[PDB]
Symmetry: C3
Subunit: 89 residues, 3 copies
Protein backbone atom coordinates (compact mmCIF):
# COMPACT_ATOMS: atom_id res chain seq x y z
CA UNK A 1 0.00 0.00 0.00
CA UNK A 2 1.03 3.61 -0.53
CA UNK A 3 2.36 5.62 2.43
CA UNK A 4 1.16 9.14 3.28
CA UNK A 5 2.03 12.17 5.39
CA UNK A 6 -0.15 15.23 6.05
CA UNK A 7 0.12 18.80 7.31
CA UNK A 8 -2.29 21.72 7.59
CA UNK A 9 -2.32 25.38 8.58
CA UNK A 10 -4.65 28.26 9.33
CA UNK A 11 -8.41 28.11 9.69
CA UNK A 12 -9.52 27.61 6.08
CA UNK A 13 -7.53 25.30 6.27
CA UNK A 14 -4.83 24.64 3.77
CA UNK A 15 -3.87 20.93 3.77
CA UNK A 16 -1.00 19.16 2.01
CA UNK A 17 -0.86 15.36 1.73
CA UNK A 18 2.26 13.62 0.41
CA UNK A 19 2.11 10.06 -0.95
CA UNK A 20 5.03 7.69 -1.54
CA UNK A 21 4.23 5.12 -4.23
CA UNK A 22 6.69 3.04 -6.24
CA UNK A 23 9.65 5.19 -5.24
CA UNK A 24 8.07 8.58 -6.01
CA UNK A 25 6.37 11.11 -3.80
CA UNK A 26 3.49 13.23 -5.06
CA UNK A 27 1.62 16.06 -3.37
CA UNK A 28 -2.08 16.88 -3.07
CA UNK A 29 -3.32 20.28 -1.98
CA UNK A 30 -6.46 21.88 -0.53
CA UNK A 31 -6.81 25.62 -0.08
CA UNK A 32 -10.59 25.62 0.46
CA UNK A 33 -11.76 25.15 -3.14
CA UNK A 34 -10.88 21.62 -4.27
CA UNK A 35 -8.01 19.12 -4.36
CA UNK A 36 -5.18 19.59 -6.81
CA UNK A 37 -1.82 18.01 -7.48
CA UNK A 38 0.97 20.23 -6.19
CA UNK A 39 4.37 21.12 -7.55
CA UNK A 40 6.21 18.73 -5.21
CA UNK A 41 7.29 15.56 -7.04
CA UNK A 42 10.54 13.93 -5.89
CA UNK A 43 11.93 10.47 -5.29
CA UNK A 44 11.27 8.61 -2.10
CA UNK A 45 10.06 5.35 -0.63
CA UNK A 46 9.02 7.07 2.61
CA UNK A 47 7.79 10.56 3.43
CA UNK A 48 7.16 12.72 6.48
CA UNK A 49 6.23 16.39 6.75
CA UNK A 50 5.98 19.33 9.08
CA UNK A 51 5.07 23.00 8.60
CA UNK A 52 4.92 26.27 10.50
CA UNK A 53 3.72 29.81 9.91
CA UNK A 54 5.79 32.99 10.10
CA UNK A 55 2.92 35.50 10.21
CA UNK A 56 0.79 34.51 7.22
CA UNK A 57 3.62 32.79 5.31
CA UNK A 58 3.80 28.97 5.35
CA UNK A 59 7.06 27.08 5.52
CA UNK A 60 6.94 23.34 4.75
CA UNK A 61 9.61 20.65 5.22
CA UNK A 62 9.22 17.27 3.54
CA UNK A 63 11.61 14.46 4.48
CA UNK A 64 11.95 11.97 1.62
CA UNK A 65 13.85 8.74 2.26
CA UNK A 66 15.27 6.03 0.01
CA UNK A 67 17.65 3.47 1.50
CA UNK A 68 19.38 5.19 4.42
CA UNK A 69 19.36 8.63 2.76
CA UNK A 70 16.86 11.25 3.81
CA UNK A 71 16.58 14.36 1.66
CA UNK A 72 14.86 17.43 3.09
CA UNK A 73 12.77 19.49 0.68
CA UNK A 74 11.80 23.05 1.57
CA UNK A 75 8.94 25.36 0.65
CA UNK A 76 9.49 28.96 1.66
CA UNK A 77 7.30 30.66 -0.98
CA UNK A 78 9.57 30.14 -4.01
CA UNK A 79 9.25 26.58 -5.18
CA UNK A 80 10.83 23.45 -3.77
CA UNK A 81 14.48 23.63 -2.74
CA UNK A 82 16.73 21.23 -0.85
CA UNK A 83 17.50 21.68 2.79
CA UNK A 84 20.53 21.24 5.02
CA UNK A 85 19.17 18.18 6.86
CA UNK A 86 21.16 14.99 6.94
CA UNK A 87 20.23 11.84 8.90
CA UNK A 88 23.53 11.76 10.86
CA UNK A 89 26.61 13.81 11.72
Amino acid sequence: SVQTAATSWGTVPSIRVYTANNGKITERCWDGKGWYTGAFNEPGDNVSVTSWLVGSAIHIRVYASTGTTTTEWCWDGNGWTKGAYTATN
Copy 2:
Protein backbone atom coordinates in the same frame (compact mmCIF):
# COMPACT_ATOMS: atom_id res chain seq x y z
CA SER B 1 5.10 -3.96 13.23
CA VAL B 2 2.06 -1.70 13.50
CA GLN B 3 2.20 1.79 11.97
CA THR B 4 1.07 4.93 13.80
CA ALA B 5 0.20 8.58 13.24
CA ALA B 6 -0.36 11.26 15.89
CA THR B 7 -1.87 14.71 16.30
CA SER B 8 -2.50 17.04 19.23
CA TRP B 9 -4.13 20.37 20.02
CA GLY B 10 -4.45 22.99 22.73
CA THR B 11 -2.54 23.13 25.99
CA VAL B 12 -4.14 20.28 27.96
CA PRO B 13 -3.40 18.74 25.43
CA SER B 14 -5.78 16.53 23.55
CA ILE B 15 -3.86 13.84 21.61
CA ARG B 16 -5.12 11.33 19.04
CA VAL B 17 -2.99 8.39 17.91
CA TYR B 18 -4.08 6.21 14.97
CA THR B 19 -2.69 2.69 14.51
CA ALA B 20 -2.83 0.56 11.35
CA ASN B 21 -2.66 -3.15 12.16
CA ASN B 22 -3.71 -6.06 9.95
CA GLY B 23 -5.65 -3.81 7.57
CA LYS B 24 -7.60 -1.88 10.21
CA ILE B 25 -7.01 1.49 11.81
CA THR B 26 -7.96 2.16 15.42
CA GLU B 27 -7.82 5.38 17.41
CA ARG B 28 -6.59 6.19 20.92
CA CYS B 29 -7.47 9.40 22.69
CA TRP B 30 -6.19 11.57 25.55
CA ASP B 31 -8.09 14.60 26.81
CA GLY B 32 -6.14 14.98 30.07
CA LYS B 33 -7.73 12.16 32.10
CA GLY B 34 -6.64 8.82 30.63
CA TRP B 35 -6.34 6.94 27.34
CA TYR B 36 -9.44 5.58 25.65
CA THR B 37 -10.30 3.98 22.35
CA GLY B 38 -12.01 6.46 20.07
CA ALA B 39 -14.89 6.18 17.66
CA PHE B 40 -12.63 6.04 14.58
CA ASN B 41 -12.31 2.48 13.25
CA GLU B 42 -11.90 2.08 9.48
CA PRO B 43 -9.93 -0.01 7.03
CA GLY B 44 -6.39 0.83 6.13
CA ASP B 45 -2.88 -0.52 5.83
CA ASN B 46 -1.38 2.95 6.28
CA VAL B 47 -2.50 6.06 8.15
CA SER B 48 -1.58 9.72 8.41
CA VAL B 49 -3.30 12.57 10.23
CA THR B 50 -3.50 16.31 10.59
CA SER B 51 -5.73 18.64 12.62
CA TRP B 52 -6.45 22.32 13.12
CA LEU B 53 -8.55 24.49 15.40
CA VAL B 54 -11.28 26.93 14.37
CA GLY B 55 -11.57 28.83 17.67
CA SER B 56 -12.02 26.06 20.24
CA ALA B 57 -13.40 23.49 17.75
CA ILE B 58 -11.06 20.75 16.48
CA HIS B 59 -11.14 19.48 12.93
CA ILE B 60 -9.26 16.24 12.20
CA ARG B 61 -8.39 14.61 8.86
CA VAL B 62 -7.23 11.00 8.76
CA TYR B 63 -5.85 9.60 5.48
CA ALA B 64 -6.32 5.82 5.33
CA SER B 65 -4.68 3.92 2.49
CA THR B 66 -5.07 0.40 1.11
CA GLY B 67 -3.48 -0.44 -2.24
CA THR B 68 -3.37 2.81 -4.21
CA THR B 69 -6.60 4.17 -2.70
CA THR B 70 -6.50 6.80 0.00
CA THR B 71 -9.73 7.58 1.81
CA GLU B 72 -9.98 10.80 3.81
CA TRP B 73 -11.99 10.64 7.04
CA CYS B 74 -13.22 13.83 8.67
CA TRP B 75 -14.06 14.88 12.21
CA ASP B 76 -15.88 18.19 12.44
CA GLY B 77 -17.76 17.61 15.73
CA ASN B 78 -20.37 15.15 14.45
CA GLY B 79 -18.79 11.76 14.07
CA TRP B 80 -16.57 10.46 11.30
CA THR B 81 -17.54 11.29 7.73
CA LYS B 82 -15.74 10.84 4.41
CA GLY B 83 -13.95 13.67 2.74
CA ALA B 84 -13.48 14.88 -0.82
CA TYR B 85 -9.79 13.92 -1.04
CA THR B 86 -8.57 11.66 -3.79
CA ALA B 87 -4.93 10.72 -4.44
CA THR B 88 -4.98 12.01 -8.06
CA ASN B 89 -6.98 14.08 -10.52
Copy 3:
Protein backbone atom coordinates in the same frame (compact mmCIF):
# COMPACT_ATOMS: atom_id res chain seq x y z
CA SER C 1 14.15 2.26 3.41
CA VAL C 2 14.19 4.08 6.74
CA GLN C 3 10.94 5.57 8.08
CA THR C 4 10.67 9.11 9.46
CA ALA C 5 8.38 11.37 11.47
CA ALA C 6 8.69 15.14 11.93
CA THR C 7 7.43 17.93 14.18
CA SER C 8 8.18 21.64 14.52
CA TRP C 9 7.30 24.60 16.71
CA GLY C 10 7.58 28.36 16.93
CA THR C 11 8.84 30.71 14.24
CA VAL C 12 12.58 29.99 14.27
CA PRO C 13 11.57 27.13 13.93
CA SER C 14 12.72 24.24 16.02
CA ILE C 15 12.31 20.95 14.10
CA ARG C 16 12.71 17.37 15.31
CA VAL C 17 12.91 14.45 12.88
CA TYR C 18 12.80 10.85 14.14
CA THR C 19 14.10 7.98 12.01
CA ALA C 20 13.42 4.26 12.48
CA ASN C 21 16.19 2.11 11.02
CA ASN C 22 17.00 -1.51 11.81
CA GLY C 23 14.84 -1.51 14.94
CA LYS C 24 16.19 1.71 16.46
CA ILE C 25 14.90 5.25 16.41
CA THR C 26 17.25 8.22 16.36
CA GLU C 27 16.49 11.93 16.55
CA ARG C 28 17.78 14.93 14.59
CA CYS C 29 17.31 18.48 15.77
CA TRP C 30 17.30 22.02 14.36
CA ASP C 31 17.03 25.09 16.57
CA GLY C 32 18.13 27.61 13.91
CA LYS C 33 21.89 26.95 13.93
CA GLY C 34 22.55 23.52 12.42
CA TRP C 35 21.43 19.89 12.62
CA TYR C 36 22.47 17.75 15.56
CA THR C 37 21.66 14.31 16.89
CA GLY C 38 19.33 14.55 19.85
CA ALA C 39 19.12 12.69 23.12
CA PHE C 40 16.24 10.47 21.97
CA ASN C 41 17.45 6.97 21.06
CA GLU C 42 15.05 4.09 21.73
CA PRO C 43 13.91 0.88 20.09
CA GLY C 44 11.30 0.87 17.40
CA ASP C 45 10.48 -0.33 13.91
CA ASN C 46 7.98 2.50 13.41
CA VAL C 47 7.74 6.04 14.75
CA SER C 48 5.24 8.88 14.89
CA VAL C 49 5.38 12.20 16.72
CA THR C 50 3.36 15.17 17.86
CA SER C 51 4.18 18.26 19.93
CA TRP C 52 2.51 21.28 21.50
CA LEU C 53 3.54 24.43 23.33
CA VAL C 54 2.49 25.49 26.82
CA GLY C 55 3.60 29.14 26.62
CA SER C 56 7.20 28.90 25.45
CA ALA C 57 7.75 25.33 26.72
CA ILE C 58 7.64 22.46 24.20
CA HIS C 59 6.13 19.10 24.99
CA ILE C 60 6.88 16.23 22.58
CA ARG C 61 5.34 12.75 22.34
CA VAL C 62 7.04 10.06 20.27
CA TYR C 63 5.18 6.79 19.62
CA ALA C 64 7.63 3.95 19.01
CA SER C 65 6.26 0.60 17.85
CA THR C 66 7.72 -2.90 17.60
CA GLY C 67 5.37 -5.82 16.95
CA THR C 68 1.99 -4.81 18.39
CA THR C 69 3.49 -2.77 21.25
CA THR C 70 3.59 0.99 21.09
CA THR C 71 5.65 2.81 23.69
CA GLU C 72 5.07 6.52 24.23
CA TRP C 73 8.13 8.63 25.02
CA CYS C 74 7.73 12.07 26.55
CA TRP C 75 9.76 15.26 26.54
CA ASP C 76 8.61 17.83 29.07
CA GLY C 77 11.92 19.67 29.60
CA ASN C 78 13.71 17.01 31.66
CA GLY C 79 14.92 14.28 29.36
CA TRP C 80 12.98 11.43 27.82
CA THR C 81 10.51 9.58 30.04
CA LYS C 82 7.86 6.97 29.29
CA GLY C 83 4.23 7.87 28.99
CA ALA C 84 0.93 6.30 29.99
CA TYR C 85 -0.16 5.45 26.44
CA THR C 86 -1.07 1.92 25.53
CA ALA C 87 -2.45 0.77 22.15
CA THR C 88 -5.61 -0.78 23.67
CA ASN C 89 -7.69 -0.96 26.84
